[PDB]
Amino acid sequence: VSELAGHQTSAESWGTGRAVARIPRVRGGGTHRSGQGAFGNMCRGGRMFAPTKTWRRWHRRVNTTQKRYAICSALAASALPALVMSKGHRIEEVPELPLVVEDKVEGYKKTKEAVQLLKKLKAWNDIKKVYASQRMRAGKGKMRNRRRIQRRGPCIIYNEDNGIIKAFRNIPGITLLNVSKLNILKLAPGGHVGRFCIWTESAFRKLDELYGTWRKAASLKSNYNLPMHKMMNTDLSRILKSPEIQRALRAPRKKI
Amino acid sequence: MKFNPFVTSDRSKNRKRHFNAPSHIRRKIMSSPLSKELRQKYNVRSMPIRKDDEVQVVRGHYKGQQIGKVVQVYRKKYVIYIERVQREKANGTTVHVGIHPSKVVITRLKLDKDRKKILERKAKSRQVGKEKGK
Amino acid sequence: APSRNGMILKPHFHKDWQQRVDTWFNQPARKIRRRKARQAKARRIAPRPASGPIRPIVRCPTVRYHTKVRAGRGFSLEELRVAGIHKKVARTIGISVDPRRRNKSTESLQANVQRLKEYRSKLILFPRKPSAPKKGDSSAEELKLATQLTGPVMPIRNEKARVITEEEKNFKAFASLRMARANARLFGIRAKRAKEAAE
RNA sequence: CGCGACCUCAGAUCAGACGUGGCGACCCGCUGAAUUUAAGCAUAUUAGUCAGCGGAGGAAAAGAAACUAACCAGGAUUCCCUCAGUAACGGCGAGUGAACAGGGAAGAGCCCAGCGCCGAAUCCCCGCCGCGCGUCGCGGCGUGGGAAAUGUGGCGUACGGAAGACCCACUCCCCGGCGCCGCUCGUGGGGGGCCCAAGUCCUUCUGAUCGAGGCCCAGCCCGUGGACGGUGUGAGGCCGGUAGCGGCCCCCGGCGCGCCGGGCUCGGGUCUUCCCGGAGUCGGGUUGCUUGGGAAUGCAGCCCAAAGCGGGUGGUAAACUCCAUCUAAGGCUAAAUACCGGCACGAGACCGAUAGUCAACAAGUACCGUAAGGGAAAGUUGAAAAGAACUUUGAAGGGAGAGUUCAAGAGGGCGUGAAACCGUUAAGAGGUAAACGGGUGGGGUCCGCGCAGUCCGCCCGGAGGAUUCAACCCGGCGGCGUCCGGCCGUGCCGGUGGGCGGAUCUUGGGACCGCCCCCGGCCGGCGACCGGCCGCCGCCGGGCGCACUUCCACCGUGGCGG
RNA sequence: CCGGACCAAGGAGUCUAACGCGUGCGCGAGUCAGGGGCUCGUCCGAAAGCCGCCGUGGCGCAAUGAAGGUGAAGGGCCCCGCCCGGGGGCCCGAGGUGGGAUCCCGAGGCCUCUCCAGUCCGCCGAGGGCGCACCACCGGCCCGUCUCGCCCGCCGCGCC
RNA sequence: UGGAAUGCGAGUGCCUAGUGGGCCACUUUUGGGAAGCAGAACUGGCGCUGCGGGAUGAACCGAACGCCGGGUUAAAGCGC
RNA sequence: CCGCGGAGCCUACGCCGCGACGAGUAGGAGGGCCGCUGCGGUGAGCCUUGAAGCCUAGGGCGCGGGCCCGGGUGGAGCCGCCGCAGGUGCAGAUCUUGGUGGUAGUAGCAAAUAUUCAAACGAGAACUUUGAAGGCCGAAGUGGAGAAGGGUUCCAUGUGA
RNA sequence: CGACUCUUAGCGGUGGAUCACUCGGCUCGUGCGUCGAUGAAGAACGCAGCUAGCUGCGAGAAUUAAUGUGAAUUGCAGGACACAUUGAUCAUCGACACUUCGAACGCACUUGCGGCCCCGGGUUCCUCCCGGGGCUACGCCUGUCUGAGCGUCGCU
């Protein structure tokens, strides 16, 4: 809010003895404003309680290692079809969830070929659900230049541009991402992992150099390696059903 | 999606410019589509509406296949008046009903040197675009 | 005011600080503006290195930093003279000049001289008039291999095992440091007492 | 005792110019409080801050060491990070509080006075001519005036400079008037103007749609354009636009290349001889303010008042001595930096008419005060005025009809239309003021596909219908498991490896080591890792199976379980 | 006692900085780019990504003294002129005592149709054993300071 | 032979709000003729707490509280 | 094995069993499928065959905060779930702004002697105009003119909001 | 029985909350970064066919010219523009024009009073009257002219 808001008037309290509250009051005469309260959060026309200030902390810094951790977790979840369907990404008839298409797509120039490719990869139902989700936002955001809302579609990861951005630009829901500039805000759209991603083979092969294996450090980032697992086997059922654990057990007490 | 950093997408700014536009900008804002036959003859899709233009109404209460003549272009009100698009007041007199030019189709345009010139400009520009795409 | 254990804090918020608060919301904007200024300058001086003139090697002046070497303001008049470069032609060639720098030692002088000779050999000199060349460079190295340098020109950047001999093995490192500090402290008064004893 | 010259002054509506005032967010020079904190209060703090005064610019100020440092030294100013809440100051209380080094952004250096040499070489004005000519510069001439020896100009300024002698190389320039093209790489460099795609298709909804279905090709059409506005409601394709190193037209430019005219046309080393500096200023005493600066950091008033192998600084006063460092009392200078005023723009996890600027509106307006000054309230008919013609009562306001509209339960302060308060209708009640909690009872409005009350599975009968079932054969798809192969691999050897590193050795190149990947051989395991045989099992389709099997519906006031 | 005639709307622990403790996450004797820079005009994007040949720097990794300054190894086993306590050599690598979750060994028991002689796994287990963290106590080491006392070193023979 | 009885699971660290006007009663007790006055000790209570009884009542007597059905009591009662 | 078959379970932050207990100011903590506004995701969510809002002797849910459905009115937007962020919840503050009651058809329309008859215009007359009576200011006036100050209030015609 | 009073519901009203909307703000950021004696900022008074305020303008006054555009403006009226013998409207804006105060400038702040030089009309070189035009402020710089001085001197 403005620093002058509510404080541009000249107003002093009348003091006690006048059968009125001791709030500051506008001086003078000959208008409705005379004698009215001022300088108070409880007064009409006064300033707010704790006026908002521009030097509020708007920005947060996250550690580089944690930011890289979040990207690795988002990538790993994008390869599990259960997690991607749990995002509502309509991955059926898609041949492989880690979808890899050739590098000719990078050279695409017309939106017609962008649409035809999505139709051939059976990723077009994702765009149709994005079309079905186009509606008007509820609230004041309609007066704040945010009138229309829609859901997210597939993310396309490329290596070289060569016109791929322009070809896929007009299709709603599609987000274009450079493999060397992976953005967590576009891989986990609402903090939720499991966004559908389509990769070019150049971006797919670059991905091992970018984040490294567990035997190799990252080649394109100095001093980085993948996070380690604190639990090698996550299959609780198999671990519990293994004869080693079962042999160490006491008989269960089913009687109620 | 708009990329020009000098073109506004703001609701208030676009509405303000529309609602207190100067008269010559209101002329191009009040453009109407040409007929399919006219779009075939001249390679033009739309022209700004003008007095003594033969149009038909394609939306609203007065929609139909009747052809009428534009008798008034009230640019301040953003409406045009057509010959037969009218109603009766309580008294008995007849008043024209304003129709937005975006809801009419030009079936015959008044032809003069200025109108021929801008018809040729719009066809030349479109033909260049088609050649560039090819 | 104080409540149990804590720190005695003395914040400097007694001076109407809210009128003088520097917010950095224009920080990204001044990075683009600085960047576009660099790119425009590089094009305007296109063949020239766009990183400024060549700076000399300089030693940092304090015990904390005298093991490091950085870039100085300009080559001194003594090293320019030894290299054989006129002080009024160095600026045109691309050599920074610092007329107010001295040369206490010779290794630092020779290091900066050799740096100047390496720059001169690596330099391409375009003729003033392209049609009529004179005492410049050849066509092969001028219009075929001339490129604008990207970073700073000549970037400035910062013992085999042997058998220990009996002499250095029997060396009193701590003892020598202690006597050395005593000798410096007592040097003046030892001489005064010797002079008084002589009298 | 007249006429001259110079000096110091004066007048002029003398010929040409220049200053004033405003704005003031940012900037420079002064002046300068108290509220407040110290739980009192005077020093301190607030604070060199608010108020007051003066002066500018698109930036200002600062600025090329009378510097830092004490190091193996750095090297103009300005800004950012850090130094650092540190050294230091402080009724050593409350509190205050920098700098150097280091990393960055930017980076650029120069000019006099003095000492000298050169016949004042210099400058202003006025004419004339050749010019050139966007609103004014060049060359000459002037037997044209003036300034200037009480000192203009050229050379030259601490990094030394000048003058002679020797040797070397020999000049790579500037300005004005003109043409070339890239017409500045973010596409033209900038400003302005005009343009450039695809449904308003078929059927339906509506007062009106931009709504809902559909549109052979696998999918209506364009998409480098699915930003946003407008349009009777919600629009990629109705319109303006939007995207595009898209098109066309006019104008204004800079940087390069060529033509003419004008000016200048000289350097660099080595040796020898000379020259070399800013005074009522520095410094000292004292007083007052100021600073983190403490036996005085900075500033100023008064008194004293210099020197020249001198002077200043070296964060504790002084004497002696050594060392380091710079060269004050003259001057100019872009960039990086600032910007609550101004001219244009863009955007927003902000507010949504008691909010957000006081001000969404004829708002610094109405109105108030003598004045300095104070300072509001106030948005919304409807898609479209289609804003109610006409009849009738009344003097009219105001009604009753009629009419417009999808709607007047939208009728010009008219979207929706709460509560407080009131009028009327319906129901109920009423002498301990009302109102309340807990129990019931009566009456009333509404509700219950309320008004012959359940529904499932198996079995038992009666009679009806149709057939696959059970098994068997063919085809397809699944599930499971030493049989085989490809992988994923640890470890382990052979390297065409040819790779990355290493504070290992070198005799930059190499050797050595550790890993990384790959190739070949051996070696273990299937689960977010693949196939193929061979079985076993299951499902589906087809055939045969043609009725004591199977299945589907009905009836019994049937029996068992729920 | 004071405020409240009634209704609507507005109306009061917020933001910044600094600390302290607790808790979630990442890395870990390190950790952190936050200031700057590199990547197409930059809808989003004033975002995100990267620097490592930007880690300058901040905090931590060393304390103590006003300062000049100085600055953190313990044990076990053998040998010794000398018997006041110190020297020498190997092996490891912070000592000892009492508690101490957990872990290890374990006499004796429980048993698969029966008896006998075996191989095991498990279970109960008296007793022992190594002992985490932490606590109490006793030793030891660094800095300041005090008392006592005998030595050692040398470009400076020293008020070292 | 775990060296009396009875009962009970203990120990320990950090951070920490409110409070820092009290008042009443049995017993003891100081000043005052005394006071529903002023000042102390111990315990319980009111304050922070409603419930049955004392007609009424901060403190008395009984008893302390989630929403209910049955049964029974406390203190106190049982002419209306 | 003449049957080829055998309920439910286990959102493990889930489900189940057993035992004891339940006062509370100041104050502390936990949970909230309680509520408000905006943002990122998601509901192939809802909506002109009717959104928000408002009213309700209707049907209900929850200990409660509150919520869902029916009906009426309205006419264009709105909500659920996973997270994010607040200018996020009112009975008080002689609170601020606006609106409204009872008082109450009440107090009051009482300073300077005084009005009456008839007519005219007019829808309408105690109050206007004309005429006739009765009275007052009584020349230091309730008269005739100016200065300050006001600024069209002056004059004619018309209206009666 | 009413009346009166209370409660509830329906409907109607003193009222303008809620919801939806927004040519407005606020905040951040970018590029520019320009007033004035050639008369600025700010005031005053005027200007439209009917027009008070806001707005725009200055005696050529809700605008002239020019260029671009290309058929309107509009509340009513009137007449342009024949919509090329080149032009309604709007935008742009480089030409022209720009009343009185105001740093404010002949003196003074009252529509007060001058002076000098010209022009026109009455009379004729009264410049007497009327009208019009140009000058007539302070400080200060270079130059110019006219001067002063028992200032310093020279020739007399």
Curated annotation (Swiss-Prot), chain A:
Q: Which residues carry this modification: N6-acetyllysine?
A: 53, 206
Q: Which GO terms describe its molecular function?
A: structural constituent of ribosome
Modified-residue entries (Phosphothreonine), positions: 213
Q: Which residues carry this modification: Omega-N-methylarginine?
A: 44
* Assembly and interaction partners: Component of the large ribosomal subunit. May bind IPO9 with low affinity. Interacts with RBM3.
How does the record describe the protein's post-translational processing?
Answer: Citrullinated by PADI4.
Cross-link Glycyl lysine isopeptide (Lys-Gly) (interchain with G-Cter in SUMO2) position reads 186
Q: Which GO terms describe its biological process?
A: cytoplasmic translation; translation at postsynapse; translation at presynapse
What is this protein's record name?
Large ribosomal subunit protein uL4
Give the sites modified to Citrulline.
247
What organism does this protein naturally occur in? Mus musculus (Mouse)
Domain of life of the source? Eukaryota
Family as reported in the entry's similarity comment? Belongs to the universal ribosomal protein uL4 family.
Keywords associated with the record: Acetylation, Citrullination, Cytoplasm, Isopeptide bond, Methylation, Phosphoprotein, Ribonucleoprotein, Ribosomal protein, Ubl conjugation
From Swiss-Prot, chain B:
Question: Gene3D superfamilies from the xrefs?
Answer: 2.30.30.30
Which terms under GO biological process does the entry name?
cellular response to ionizing radiation; cytoplasmic translation; DNA damage response, signal transduction by p53 class mediator; positive regulation of intrinsic apoptotic signaling pathway in response to DNA damage by p53 class mediator; translation at postsynapse; translation at presynapse
InterPro entries, sorted: KOW, Rib_uL2_dom2, Ribosomal_uL24_CS, Ribosomal_uL24_euk/arc, Ribosomal_uL24_KOW, Translation_prot_SH3-like_sf
Compartment annotation? Cytoplasm
Q: Name one GO molecular function term.
A: structural constituent of ribosome
Maturation and modification: Ufmylated by UFL1 in response to endoplasmic reticulum stress, promoting reticulophagy of endoplasmic reticulum sheets.
Q: Which UniProt keywords apply?
A: Cytoplasm, Isopeptide bond, Phosphoprotein, Ribonucleoprotein, Ribosomal protein, Ubl conjugation
**Statement: the UniProt record of this protein carries the keyword Phosphoprotein:** yes
Major localization class: cytoplasm
Q: How does it assemble?
A: Component of the large ribosomal subunit. Interacts with DHX33.
This molecule's function is given as:
Component of the large ribosomal subunit. The ribosome is a large ribonucleoprotein complex responsible for the synthesis of proteins in the cell.
| The protein, known as | Large ribosomal subunit protein uL24
Which species is this UniProt entry from? Mus musculus
Curated annotation (Swiss-Prot), chain C:
One GO BP annotation of this record: blastocyst development
Main location, first listed in the record: cytoplasm
Q: Where is this cross-link: Glycyl lysine isopeptide (Lys-Gly) (interchain with G-Cter in SUMO1)?
A: 169
- Pfam families given in the database record: Ribosomal_L13e (PF01294)
Modified residue annotations for Phosphoserine: 51, 76, 105
This protein's GO CC annotations: cytoplasm; cytosol; cytosolic large ribosomal subunit; endoplasmic reticulum; nucleolus; postsynapse; presynapse; ribosome
What subcellular locations does the record give?
Cytoplasm
Q: Which residues carry this modification: N6-acetyllysine?
A: 15, 172
| Entry keyword set | Acetylation, Cytoplasm, Isopeptide bond, Phosphoprotein, Ribonucleoprotein, Ribosomal protein, Ubl conjugation
Q: What molecular function does GO assign, one term?
A: structural constituent of ribosome
Locate the cross-link: Glycyl lysine isopeptide (Lys-Gly) (interchain with G-Cter in SUMO2).
122, 144, 169, 172
HAMAP family for this protein: Ribosomal_eL13
* Subunit record text: Component of the large ribosomal subunit.
Per the entry, what this protein does is:
Component of the large ribosomal subunit. The ribosome is a large ribonucleoprotein complex responsible for the synthesis of proteins in the cell.
Which protein family is it in? Belongs to the eukaryotic ribosomal protein eL13 family.
Q: What is this protein called?
A: Large ribosomal subunit protein eL13
Q: Source species, please?
A: Mus musculus (Mouse)
